[PDB]
Point group: D3
Chain length 297, copies 6
């Protein structure tokens, strides 16, 4: 069994714990987190929790459940220890550059790193690749939501006067998205001001955005999310081939599970860095290939 450690303990983290414990081919060595209180959280009962991975014995792979901005440095740090890594880095714009950066680091330390292994980027990327070669000429549209956006939500919370906030991603169709923000204000804060700060923030300025003040944001919080991917294209010279993929899932739960499968695959690769479309799909499945070929193909 692959000895694994969960690094970082947040949403994906708690879900990461469950994903690893449920894996038939993995052994959870422990959890690495910034804070370890005397009052051990219920789900962490019986689980080794430390502040540094060096305090976990013989860790072979690590799930990097830390904020996107922290992924690059964390990945390099773990790889330099010879530990395989998996993350769900979600910036489509430069994940290709992240791959280029980590590839030599991983190879030089005899480890494998699989980046952007969530559902998007991640499994949705594989789906987009399938639709692309099944019908080479055409257009694919990826429509997200209804679901909460962590990035957009954080941006709102960073605004003075905001006690808490939730930014909902709403599909407008054809790959366009609208934003529905719900904000809980600090005592005496001005809504008009906050509303402006939100609608004009570079993270919202490009999309239709609506803001609503609420008594409690936690009362509106749900981590479910979804996607509708569609493509209308040409297979060979035959037009109007229609494809549609839809998912309604628990965001952090799925992300954590995909990360687990991706780490399983990482341990099977030659040293280096990979995105999910660079790994044979069967490497994401536990155990020998034969049984899976007979069951799934």
């Amino acid at each position: 069994k692959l000895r694994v450690a969960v690094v970082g303990y947040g949403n994906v983290g708690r879900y990461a714990l469950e994903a690893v414990q449920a894996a038939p081919d993995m052994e959870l060595v422990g959890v690495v987190r910034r804070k370890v209180l005397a009052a051990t959280p219920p789900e962490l009962t019986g689980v080794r929790v430390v502040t540094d991975i060096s305090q976990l014995e013989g860790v072979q792979g690590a799930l990097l459940c830390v904020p996107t901005r922290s992924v690059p440095e964390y990945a390099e740090a773990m790889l330099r220890r010879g530990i395989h890594t998996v993350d769900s880095y979600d910036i489509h714009g430069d994940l290709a550059d992240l791959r280029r950066r980590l590839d030599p680091v991983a190879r030089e330390h005899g480890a494998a790193a699989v980046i952007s292994a969530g559902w998007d980027p991640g499994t949705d990327s594989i789906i987009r690749a399938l639709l692309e070669f099944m019908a080479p000429k055409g257009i694919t549209y990826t429509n997200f939501g209804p679901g909460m956006s962590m990035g957009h939500s954080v941006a709102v919370k960073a605004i003075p006067g905001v006690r808490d906030a939730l930014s909902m991603t709403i599909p407008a169709g054809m790959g366009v998205h609208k934003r529905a923000v719900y904000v809980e204000l600090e005592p005496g804060a001005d809504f008009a001001e906050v509303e402006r700060a939100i609608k004009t923030d570079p993270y919202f300025v490009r999309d239709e955005t609506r803001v609503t003040q609420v008594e409690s944001v936690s009362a509106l919080m749900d981590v479910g999310h979804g996607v509708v991917m569609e493509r209308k294209g040409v297979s060979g010279a035959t037009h109007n081939q229609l494809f549609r993929f839809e998912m309604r899932i628990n965001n952090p739960a799925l992300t954590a599970q995909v990360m687990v499968a991706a780490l399983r695959a990482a341990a099977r690769q030659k040293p280096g860095c990979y995105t999910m479309i660079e790994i044979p799909v069967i490497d994401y499945l536990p155990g020998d290939r034969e049984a899976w070929i007979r069951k799934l193909v």
Copy 2:
């Protein structure tokens, strides 16, 4: 460019021709077929057509567009020539055994063979694998149709008294299928007899089957088909994750296009035999990886 030959000229074959001609990284050397008449078919104008692949110059890969029962022998024959091969062998029951048989033949002759590369088996297999690792605990249902089944149709035509026939695959849900057969009888043939021969044939006996006599079967023929794949499962320890994939496509057109993508991938593999879930998805896309990673991930 990969020098390719289309072996066998039928539905998938004519669609195979178009798939290859539309590929940016391939050069169609010609078509291999059993019959070459003086009256050259319109679409084959300007295309080299011969009865043996040895008459095609420097062929590097071949699309085996022949009947399923002919695939094993054809694949071995081409592999023994050092030619990469792709087929859409559709028998789920023993394609794993086909893989075992062809693997050493391919490797011994320095070639790669990708079997069962249609949409099912094929791309649907990849999808099933994705749903499997995204939510390990649960059940996946693959529902086919409405669409014509070649195998079932042939069986009906093999029945004395049948001039022509068409067997429609109808989804009953939860992976169960019904059959709607339309038959055109020979002069003086008995419908009751044929109907019995159909409903009791081992290819129909297990499913609800209905037979209708028609004046003309060709007037009812359409090669469109489709699938609805669904899974409700557990990601980690989180239940009720919902997934759905649907496709409404031209059967032979899609199959031929996938075969083309699979042959592209074959040329990039170490010698041996592979099913589509044993190949990194990016290998199915033409050209360098970098651009695809930036566009799709």
Copy 3:
């Protein structure tokens, strides 16, 4: 305006009354029914009601709102008076023969008769014709319900021991239908007996039928109905053209409205008998053609 009479007063009849009153190009002369009591029904207040068409002045057209079995004789009777007629005769198997029977009768008396002008046969017939020429090669499926079937219901009411009942038509897909019967038994009637008489009745024997006993059938009665017509076919040489038409409507209300439109068309035809696919669609629209061409084409 066309002087019209409603002949027969039942569901379609009451709905026929409203359809005529709402027509901008028609004048309701009155209603012909076999029962005319002193206590005139509310909706018939201010409406001339008689037992014979001869007592209605200058009637030019008549809506035959009588049972299917009574249509042939009523149509001939009205046509022989020089009155245009419309009916919704619903027997697909013999309406073609009805057409040949009424054609010379209509022509000989200088009148036009449009038969089977409901939604099926009728408007659905036109739709099926369109899908047929838009994609000549393929199969069209017409799926009815959920909705009550008059014929099936009356058949059940004919069974001794049944105080009242209704038969629901349920679509099973691919043109196949199931039956859901609800029966109210007379005091002291035996359910098992009735159930058997139903499931073995020639009107039910060939379809999956379920029977449920209820305290009151009137409490379950709703005249809504619907249809889903689908076709997957070849336009020219291009396969997998997809078409779908769905309707959720009040059965008798729509039938009566279509009959009104068909009578309007009848008044514009050369004497003879027509089905709805034998009349230019614009003849079903009131007033000059020009305006409709600009509005709808």
Copy 4:
């Protein structure tokens, strides 16, 4: 069999060729096109191709597969030769005037012309007419796409600096549409400039438009299209009657097939000009009426 000629060779043209060849009641005499090079296109192998219809023997009907702006003149030219004509003229605002212009020309030369015989205008027009008389009071919405708009796409290409481009029609609901334009710029062309020229063009100014620059437009080209027609209206005096028609098809393939059916109908009409709602639907079906009535009504 009706001797037919395909005039103009483009998308609808190639599909026009297939539609005619697939028609059981027509004989393709040949194709009329502007250029006839020595290297005969594969599909035109064995087909007579000339630059003037006078060089085609005994042509009785012609499918005018030329640009919309060329239809009026081509129709008159062919009608003046006594040849029946069919076109898919798609300008809803003036086709009524086209009808009035061509009517006397057609009649004076003993020929019939059916204009605007595509799917919209054309078959969709018939559908709108049906929904109108089935429920006279209400509103019908016709929602197009996702699908490429030839007209909008040509407008973009007419702009200096654009090498190639395609305009996608996107349904916003309630008959409102948005435009998604993808453009391939000429070497050293300015995107901002082109983008402005597009969004400002009179063909786009009224609709929400988005422009994206792509490396290759041909790689995004698909001729599939679709429509969703819905009506909520009153049948007689009964409100909320619900109707819905949806289609997902190959645009030029369907258009060409409808044109073929309309030409068939043209040959059966009294001399003059007709829109598709002025012809009995059965005239669009090949052969005797009887068989179709028993089969479809």
Copy 5:
């Protein structure tokens, strides 16, 4: 049986008449309306119609089918007579205040009043309450239409130059609505002026609004309407619970039926004022509780 009177005679009124007549536990004493002409309307034949409730004998309950602005005063007037009342007051913003105003009036006179008993507010309110306690953390979206809005329509009719008009409510998703207005102008009226007066009216200024001029608005009128209520929330600590409720109905017909059920419930309550979520659902069902518990639970 509860002796009931219908107060006010309009859409909901005529539908109110039918709802009461169809109730098994009610006896219609008569209708109260401000206009009683010699030519008694057909449906009111045999029904006592007067201008004051005092002229109806032993009335125990009244359906207030009057405009929203007239509800408060009518409710107080009837309650002060000891008559139970039901209304469908639709102003979400102040109905809570209406409740506090009517509560002591109802109690003081020994009667019960159920306010805002339509489908929204009303039954939709109950649904929203259920979804709220089934999944306490999340957001519920109520999407209305396509359907005519009385308030929006009357507002447009108030604009000088407008002979008649109707405003269609269009769902844009996530609780946002657009408006589609159709207007019939008085002879010599200016469209541009009217259009501006509409789009800038406080009832339209905050929503995307489109105005179309038509020859006749009555030809576009249909009272059908609908709703789609959705919620994605957390049950306990389990996220992504999905709920969806949809309705396609005749607006005034349903409203009147709900009012009838609510009046039935009113007669069973302690004196005071209630909204529909303050009454046990079984009190809306006629007769003893036992039978309903066995039938529905």
Copy 6:
């Protein structure tokens, strides 16, 4: 805050724990369960767990999370202690008798009991009641699944030779259901035998049942479930009113949350026994009524 105890610890139990902890108006006193081992389960860390409710201080209400057959006795035992109770007893055929049995027990001990408070019976019951009074004449169909049936699954496990198994409930439409059973056999057990024992069992005999042998049942286990409730009925005298309610949820999670809401309501009722349709919906919401009325109505 209401002091609550969770009685019985299983699926609904673990979810019951979370539901109570998430309730703003409740204080979890502890959990009552049959076995309390030294190794305290992680989620029960910090939670008082005992074998008898008497060892929990000042408990005011209890969620009976025990098997259906144990509910009657447990309810009486808790009620006799003056503790309010809530259960999700799911036998539609006898819950009415349960209500009559518990009513006097509850009242005599000054407590309130709400029975059958899951989603069906429970919240679905309220929905059925709503659809019933909104459209009194018609038929409502409740279609369950895809989802695991605890009862059917237990029945299979009770069969000798089966190590483990799960029975999936499949909707066939119109309230009819099919069963899909997956069984894991004990070492050396006979499948044919087990298959017969299953399909013949009184819990399966009436429904179409399919049995499949699998290597592992736990690998197929998911507690997600769902329902589609539909009604087509008459509001007043207006037919074809259409209603549809769908839910895709975690079965035990929802059940536990509804039970929590029902216990909250129980504490607010006069002593006695109630089904969910006998309680005003607002009593299921925490805190004062005013806020909820302004927010939801």
